[model samples]
Target: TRGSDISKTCCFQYSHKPLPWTWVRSYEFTSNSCSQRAVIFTTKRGKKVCTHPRKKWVQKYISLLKTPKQL
Candidate 1:
């Protein structure tokens, strides 16, 4: 629930746009019954969109969040 309060539309810029902008984040999960190896993405709000770890754009955004912004 890290980004629970944050906007679910891939940020505030293209909130009303289409495609990639609409994609949201979904954390990985697993169960004793099955296993999902990679993440995926979807364009629906509240929907689970999990992108693969190898996705360059996704990795870049993740990295950006991890780094501190300098004044």
Candidate 2:
């Protein structure tokens, strides 16, 4: 054999299941000196999902939440 199978060698399982927009309970924005930024979304079921802040879908929901400046 020229090479080993890849799927069996991978360390983590990968899967994607869509979450309803209405299920998002809250979100947080993070930025560090290393130039990394992300948006963390918390679901009503207590699950946390991380995504890029610049995502169009993420901005759509984030706009609906009250910001500290708006409160």
Candidate 3:
């Protein structure tokens, strides 16, 4: 999996701070059921503030239920 992001966020020095910083994630998977390779892509957004509350980015789960068969 591959992705790209060029979004920009602006923040001011006040109670209402702007958001900045951009990040991306990629995943590559190989399995027999898939018959081919696969990939999962995701991203997150966040900002830094001094006087605002702490907030985490959202979650982009690829597949939480996908686990290898246990013998």
Candidate 4:
């Protein structure tokens, strides 16, 4: 039960517009089991919002998100 939590955050909806760059703190992909392919953006406020997986903006955002590698 508690061990299998991957599906809980599966994407149910999506955003078509690019989020303000400063507003997004991180990003992650939806669970593979979920039918909808989504890119979940982690907002600065700690909220997770789903976005279309294949978009120029999404790819750009991920690039910025990955820039700050943790040491």
Candidate 5:
């Protein structure tokens, strides 16, 4: 008799609680199109986390500055 011995086969419950602080997104790309093309957006005024680095519009404004916020 090599079969049924079902003593406990119940499994279905998921809510793995452990998410209150976690965020990490990154991206980078540049091969120079000769006219400057870019796009980047970020927001964090009360803890929403943000990152941006993908905009180089027309390649003429060689100085994009806005880096003093990190948490």
Candidate 6:
């Protein structure tokens, strides 16, 4: 029961699971101090996730959001 779970920080490691397309509200790059080049997906529940850009599922999810069903 806390709203302070989120933080503005660099990503240490990238998440592997495929996130639902509609669940995330925003997408942006991680902090400059981050070692991994990750995309931070802020979900509808205020959960900030660091997901890799190279993963196939991640690419698919992004594809679903970006274009008009080109995949």
Q: Which ten residues in a row have the lowest lDDT in candidate 6?
A: 62-71
lDDT of all predictions: 0.39, 0.54, 0.29, 0.73, 0.25, 0.63
Q: List the lowest-lDDT window of 10 residues for candidate 5.
A: 54-63
Worst 10 residues of 2 by lDDT: 6-15
Worst 10 residues of 1 by lDDT: 9-18
| Alpha-carbon runs more than 4 Å astray in model 3 | 1-21, 45-71
1-71 in candidate 1: lDDT tens per residue? 55433322331111122235435433332222333444334443755454544567655544433332323
Clashing pairs in 3: 11-18
Local accuracy of candidate 4 as per-residue lDDT tens digits, 1-71 = 55434434677777777777687788777777776677777889888888765778877877777853534
What lDDT tens digits, residue by residue, belong to model 6 across residues 1-71? 75343345777657777667578765555666656566666677878777776777766665554543323
Best of the candidates, TM-score: 4
With candidate 3 superimposed using the best TM-score fit, by how many Å does residue 48's alpha carbon deviate from the native?
Answer: 25
Cα lDDT tens digits for candidate 2, 1-71: 89422311111212134467688687556534324556666688977666555667666656664462533
**What is the lDDT for 27 in model 2?**
58
Alpha carbon deviation, residue 55, candidate 4 (Å): 1.4
State which candidate has the highest lDDT: 4
| TM, every model | 0.32, 0.55, 0.21, 0.68, 0.17, 0.55
In candidate 5, which residue ranges exceed 4 Å CA deviation?
A: 1-21, 37-71
Predicted structure 1: lDDT = 0.39
Task: State the displacement of the C-alpha of residue 43, model 3, in Å, after optimal TM-score superposition.
Answer: 1.9
Q: For each candidate in turn, give its C-alpha RMSD to the true structure in angstroms.
A: 10.1, 14.4, 15.5, 4.9, 21.4, 7.8
Backbone collision count in every prediction?
2, 0, 1, 0, 10, 0
* Between candidates 4 and 6, the lDDT winner: 4
